[PDB]
């Protein structure tokens, strides 16, 4: 009953992506679980389709240039698929409480919903202060956890409706293509100091060799790269200039391993840089230590308002691909255009992509070597949580719709191509 | 000997909300504990020694080399491979011999390794010991300004200060009333004018209309919006039928604020934040707030820190607040459509907040320092609200 629109992306259990139409009744779709999920029925028909997009001030790119930020978090789905939602439990008497309403094709849907009761006055000890000690203690979880068809969104209450988000999960799942590049290739510490070189690269690096720059006051970053460049049989060189005394230039000598990587897993491609799209599904520990290469590379760490990590960026494919990276890992992330530096030439537009996260920015910060950049690892074990993201809801016209269905009491959860986290009966 | 020594001037907080320097502090003199009760001073050490200023790392004192820094650290533990070995990584609480020959006791971060050929056996089982050998995420611990620079550059860097919420309350503001007036009050003094109980508010957005509205009758007082304050925004509000919030010429946030009722001070900043707020939820809630009158900019860190918030700023000044829970009990008393936000799911506490500091060696000079009774938990508050140490005594 619950489809989505022609195109939809779908991620894989294999961490491949593939258009709804395309997904046949045996394949199996990636779970939440980072586990497959067996495509039981693909639903078909026509219904009023509706648009869910993260509300942000970006919103563009769709069928133009790649300058513009794009919004990844959105879908079109059928008016009657239910959105996989979450509204904080809250308490001020006002509260937030599952709910029933009267839905105007009478329905009666459940739903949250803020009330409020109101008791006389001089007795306010056990009167009202009785309820909030019990709602506070009412659940341990700070938040509900329910899901309401796109029609029925309309019938949710201001403040409910302003509170509620959809969810995107990390991908838990792992692909293993970087240490088979690499074994294929012809040490255990291998893959870890490929992918922070590539970091590095990526962050700064000479389009056309194995070179990059470097912090020449970070002592203990250089030793870092020697130290890593080692690793591989890299010997590493350093350069004096770059930045008007600040900066390095370092080139990897050895066929050149670092540079074969760039080319043979694509991050390099047709002369312009990228993040490859198998890193999204590839060994975790690789996205992290990758992206502590991109921190230390051009980046900076900030602690104000929580623990918080920003990438710069000039290229649109590491913009993106850095945004879907990020993700991957369970990282909140944002992105934002401002002015660019010059270096010689003049780029009009640079990208700032911020990624927040607790234990999960700590767990990545913890292998850069950067001064400032690295922060120690969490104190303890973590859960990479699912994300939130506000979202507004359009209705659009009548159109065909495909969907798919999960097999008997699985969680009816699967994820789409950009992580949201989506439903199906 | 023996005690907290900070240089003259240094501003602590006594127990009665009111301020008083270092040196004018007397024994018998109660300052603030960081649970909102006193601290007696029992004795008033003094002397000389070399001094080490500590400021925030973009909260500032002024203490003596042996003045015993309240610090945490948070613990870590972290496995890696690598003449191949599995490594643990962790911080804890280790031992250090000073160039003094003095052995400090200090956070460090040790490493332990054993071949790759052994077995995760052991490495498995010290991360199970280190996961579980404490009731919390972090250290809570002291270190003489002196000794600061003994720690490794990884733990020093992860090591910081803090600054408590001001539990105390006074009913200064209560107490005068012959809430509603915090919040208008905030609205007053966000977006209003100066020399006439008149204030701006956005015309469109019914929901802070009716506050403003409703509030005004609580306190017996007519409506009035002569139009046309801002071009097709602002729709003027006057108020037809003290405590510090005008003071010379410019907008001021009154000082008893930050330890009047936490209800007040909270519904004043919600008053202000509808008023000319910009709240956002990008990487967890935040609030800001943009002001020219340095008085207001100095008065809101002031308020919003005595709550437990997180505070930053950045003529125009910009402060940035944020906090979780605290900072939720503080939207969810706003009226402005996109300034309410939900208040918290439970109870929370007004924890400490953290702050990364630079500690630099001064000159020699005096100190004035106190003591509080052995009795007590040897803490107390500064005028900036960081949590100091102060050595007990008989
Ligand atoms: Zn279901
Ligand atoms: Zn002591």
Redesign the interface.
């Known amino acids: 009953e619950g489809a989505f629109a022609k195109g939809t992306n779908v991620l894989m259990a294999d961490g491949s992506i593939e258009c709804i139409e395309n997904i046949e009744v045996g394949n199996k779709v990636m779970g939440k679980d980072g586990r497959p999920r067996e495509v039981i029925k693909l639903p078909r028909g026509r219904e009023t389709m509706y648009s869910v997009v993260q509300k942000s001030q970006h919103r563009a790119h769709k069928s133009d240039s790649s300058r513009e930020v794009p919004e990844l978090l959105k879908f079109t789905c059928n008016a009657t698929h239910e959105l996989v939602v979450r509204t904080?439990?809250?308490?001020?008497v006002?509260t937030?409480e599952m709910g029933q309403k009267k839905a105007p094709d009478g329905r009666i849907v459940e739903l949250v919903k803020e009330v409020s009761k109101s008791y006389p006055i001089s007795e306010g000890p056990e009167r009202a202060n009785e309820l909030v000690?019990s709602?506070?203690?009412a659940?341990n979880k700070?938040?509900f956890e329910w899901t309401i068809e796109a029609r029925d969104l309309s019938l949710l209450g201001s403040?409910v409706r302003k509170?509620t988000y959809q969810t995107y999960a990390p991908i838990l799942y792992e692909n293993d293509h970087f240490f088979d590049y690499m074994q294929k290739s012809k040490?255990?510490?291998g893959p870890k100091v490929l992918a922070y070189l590539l970091g590095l690269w990526i962050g700064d690096g000479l389009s056309d060799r194995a070179t990059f720059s470097v912090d020449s006051r970070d002592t203990?970053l250089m030793e870092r790269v020697t130290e890593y460049a080692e690793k591989l049989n890299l010997c590493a060189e350093y350069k004096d200039r770059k930045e008007p005394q600040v900066a390095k230039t370092v080139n990897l000598y050895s066929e050149n391993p670092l540079w074969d990587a760039i080319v043979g897993l694509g991050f390099l491609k047709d002369g312009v840089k990228n993040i490859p799209s198998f890193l999204s599904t590839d060994n975790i520990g690789t996205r992290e230590t990758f992206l502590a290469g991109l921190i230390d590379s051009d980046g900076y760490v900030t602690?104000?308002?929580?623990i918080?990590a920003t990438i710069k960026t000039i290229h649109t494919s590491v913009r993106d691909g850095l945004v879907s990276l990020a993700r991957s890992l369970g990282l909140?992330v944002?992105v934002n255009a401002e002015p660019a530096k010059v270096d010689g030439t003049k780029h009009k537009i640079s990208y700032a992509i911020?990624m927040?996260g607790g234990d999960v920015l700590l767990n990545v910060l913890?292998k850069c070597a950067g001064?400032?950049k690295?922060?120690?690892?969490?104190?303890?074990?973590f859960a990479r949580e699912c994300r939130g993201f506000?979202f507004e809801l359009q209705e659009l016209k009548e159109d065909d719709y495909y969907g798919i269905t999960l097999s008997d009491d699985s969680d009816h959860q699967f994820l789409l191509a950009n992580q949201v986290v989506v439903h199906a009966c």
């Open positions: 904080p439990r809250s308490v001020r006002i937030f000690e709602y506070r203690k659940s700070a938040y403040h509170a040490t255990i510490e203990s602690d104000e308002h929580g918080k909140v944002s911020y927040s913890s001064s400032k690295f922060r120690p690892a969490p104190a303890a074990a506000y």
